[model samples]
Target: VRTIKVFTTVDNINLHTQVVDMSMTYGQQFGPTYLDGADVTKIKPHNSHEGKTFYVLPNDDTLRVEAFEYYHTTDPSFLGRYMSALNHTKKWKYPQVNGLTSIKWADNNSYLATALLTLQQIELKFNPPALQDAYYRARAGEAANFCALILAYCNKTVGELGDVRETMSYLFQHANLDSCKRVLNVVCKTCGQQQTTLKGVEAVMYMGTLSYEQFKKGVQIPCTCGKQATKYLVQQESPFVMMSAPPAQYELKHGTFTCASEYTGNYQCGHYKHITSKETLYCIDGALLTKSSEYKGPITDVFYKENSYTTTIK
Candidate 1:
């Protein structure tokens, strides 16, 4: 057999009071069992407080024992009945509460409120199993009653005239769809139709600048005609392009000329050429070794060397 053991303080004080007060006032009846100064034989007397001790007198003939004590204003029976009614109303009326209109207004108070309310609506509508679980698992009376009240208020304020589930479904579908559309617009603006290819062979060059060590690395050669193709060092002087009278032997192929750098170079030229020969040349009693391979033949086509550098813009 199932039994509800309503263990409470000896007197019928409020169940919600702190534990210390409850312990001090409990007794079988309002009066203390012992007299204040009573004497006993062969036993030391214990304290004579109203709730310091208790004794149980069982009567098997009674179907129920309603224990009571004086000085407790609230009746347990009445309070228990009232709490039961509140719980019952919450369970039976949860659907109606959830169906109320203008819940959107309440949710607009904050982003968190809006999100929770939106989730609640979805569960209440299409996911009835989850909603029932949440509702029944809540504590009896006050908590259950409050949830029921909120649901009903929301339905009346925001829900359309229809079955509770259908009203919730409409609200959820509308809100989620609108939110998705806004997100799509932001994605389109940032990503659509943008070119994302790297511009050079060396990853550092693609980053737009390089150190001195990087420039000494073999010039980047292009495999195809694209923005990345225009990155090779050019030979300024070719054997076929002769200067008048060949100038001086000392002046052989040395002269200042325009050459293109990596990103700024022209891509129309088919290839790059080298001007300095491998043989060391003497200049004014000083030896100069060629920094690049010697030009074997001439000026068929030319392109520029590309490397990273920083320049000041005024």
Candidate 2:
């Protein structure tokens, strides 16, 4: 029902996506007649590829038809599968789409639509009537699989091989989907400075160009130390379905922030604020709008603190 052609070259790979006419013939015992290409031959897995293994499922009814591809190097200098075992355990190293080096989508008709429609029709006709729950679950499962594939393709295109980072985030330009952008929260390791940011379009574009491993190691951000900070406690998040609107410009009732008067017992304005102090007199509301404040003084050797906001609304 589905076929995959695998090719390995020095720096290129090609993956073709195509589907033929699909018709659910009634009355016959196995009525699903799906055929594509000049000849409907069974697709076979490549036997000679040694470093990585490619997989394809024979059943068209199955949700995921491709297995995750594992990439390994042939050099003897590097650590072998021992290191990879942990990486694979922690997360999906690479989905099937990552293997193909193709720069463009296949120049074919809407085969995806053709296949998707047939899949639903087959489910409605073949699923047990009394157990209607089976039908819904199967249908929902297919939808989920399709969503995963879409997300995988998005990540792949923004990633290294695709190198279309400059224009990738623009695909999400729908005004209502702005909240779906990524949020990055980070803390400076040396100065203990913390920051949260909603990555803009350009920021998202550039960040996607780097490997996750590189991003995890460090990202350069301005720190309280008045220097570019490389080390951080990094956390990244994205919203799936969220309500986003232009923020209501509300005036702050409280006066602009001022450094708390010097006090004892690890309080703000103390001669030396404790590096890990939580005794600040003021606290920012995370439940409301995230606020940004300016530090009007020189970088201090002690703990960092937000001094004041420059405007009424932030």
Candidate 3:
């Protein structure tokens, strides 16, 4: 009873695959359909080992739906959501695939599959669920409409009536604690409305071309004098899952990633690693592999905004 194209994802620039027959889509979706009896559709990229027989879609972790997979039948947290979001990228492929993926994102809660060959990064771990407890993990808002969308894009100024409890740490988790705090505001783009990536594709994970009201009222942006500015965003993540990465002699391309990472109390590559004060410290397992769909670095601060890099900006 799940067949009007319902399992969605294939946004592009690199791996968010599985559209063999539109299991779902504003443009697409439909990767795993019971298996072996045939409902599969089409998921092609290339590279494999276990010769065939995978299956990990129900709560899809990137993917894995070959010949009815097993092991007490599903649940390695679905391949640990893209093998820890690519652990720390070894290498990947499958970036240049579509010229018509056609983006459509609004509510599938949270999706980006492939820690991947489609792209890379693959990370972010926030557990505890019985039915995928992600996507607005506390959704029941009115903390002044999320403090008025976090004061229309972050920065404080409360003194008129003074005491009003709050919550919505990006939509839930900040439960009225004292010592009010805020500073998780970032909305930047300096690459521009044009690009050309593809040469072994290091960072190519983009979502469908876009439509569905341009993925729901997202890029209309107008800020000069008349007014309108809640637009300046981007989003690209593909956390690999079609479970087939252990039988290598190299043939595994079709990876993608994200789980977006960075942790600068001092961290690595999502960038923010500045050290000094008589530096001395070596080798690491520091946990936070450098993955990106952001900060290609040094654009000399390019700005001529109209909001269009295919506009999604997660």
Candidate 4:
């Protein structure tokens, strides 16, 4: 009777719905479903029951893992951003570093080193004594702090330098005031401008607020692109799609927007005409064939005649 009961129970168990938390990275062979752009928000174990396992599922649009068994924990925001940046920077023409360790170390070191180098270059370029001294001290302190963070996080040799926990603690304590402020300043002076420029282009299409001239010249458009258009289309259709302006806006004005075309070719008047049937083509500038009454096709099929369009920005 006991043997029969065991058999019956085993037969009743459903393997399909059984969740298993593997605690593996997404891209591995034995890992969970691979999603290209999916962001994993959290991970936890399946249950506290007798036959509980660690498995993950989408929780409120976020990928979450069950962490009961192996205690797999991560800062979702940091990890997501880190992974995204890592994937993106790999394809670019930037300096090639080695393994993950090398990459991480190089990123941290290079950032701080570059800042120092830039300061030195500026000192030489401008030859301002007071600015040079201040920049030297500031760059030295920045490099030291960055090195400390790297040693604590990667090296794991904690003595007077401190461990990952101590480093994280220090970051937490001072991050908001000092590090964050500095990062923000740098971002605002550099990254933020780039983001803002891209977003401005997007806003022109999505919000339908900016004009073709505004988009072409980087000025905020006062008028909308009417009811039919989106911000993405406006920017995508622009000549400056996916290419940085020459003599980078950075070198030009420190903070200014400019339009530059990366891809070259004639504009398809046919596709434009087709899209405009439902929506309007309010703007097109900086292409070989500026204006075409007849629709041909875009220089590339990347932007085709589809209900929706999607592409990644490098």
User: lDDT for every model?
Assistant: 0.23, 0.25, 0.22, 0.23
State which candidate, 2 or 3, has the greater TM-score. Answer: 2
Candidate 3 CA-lDDT value: 0.22
Ten residues in a row with the worst lDDT in model 3? 109-118
Q: List ranges where model 2 is wrong by over 4 Å.
A: 1-163, 175-181, 186-191, 199-209, 221-226, 231-234, 239-314
Kindly list the per-residue Cα lDDT of model 3 for residues 130-206, writing each as its tens digit.
11132122122112222222222112232111100111121112111222221111222432242222211112211
| Model 4 lDDT, residue 89, Cα | 35
Per-candidate Cα RMSD to the true structure, in Å, reads 35.1, 21.7, 22.9, 22.2
lDDT of 4 by residue, 1-314 (tens): 11110010111122123333335232231233212223332332222322432222323222333211111233333223323433333322222111001112232232222222222221122122222333343344322322333232233221222222222232223212211110000112222322222332231122221122233333332223222221222223222212112111111111122211112222211111101111212112201113222333321111111122223322
Expressed as tens digits, the lDDT of each residue in 243-275 for candidate 2 is 111122222112321221111222112121101
| Residue-level lDDT for 253 in candidate 3 | 12
What's the distance in Å from true for residue 64, model 1?
A: 33
Best by lDDT: 2
**Candidate 4: Cα lDDT at 85:** 39
Q: Model 4 — which ten-residue stretch has the worst lDDT?
A: 1-10
Ranking by TM-score: 2, 4, 3, 1
Arrange candidates, best lDDT first. 2, 4, 1, 3
After superposition, which runs of candidate 1 have C-alpha atoms over 4 Å from their true positions?
Answer: 1-143, 146-314
Off by over 4 Å in 3: 1-41, 44-50, 58-270, 274-280, 283-314
Candidate 2 accuracy as TM-score: 0.21
Q: For every model shown, what is its TM-score relative to the native structure? A: 0.15, 0.21, 0.16, 0.17
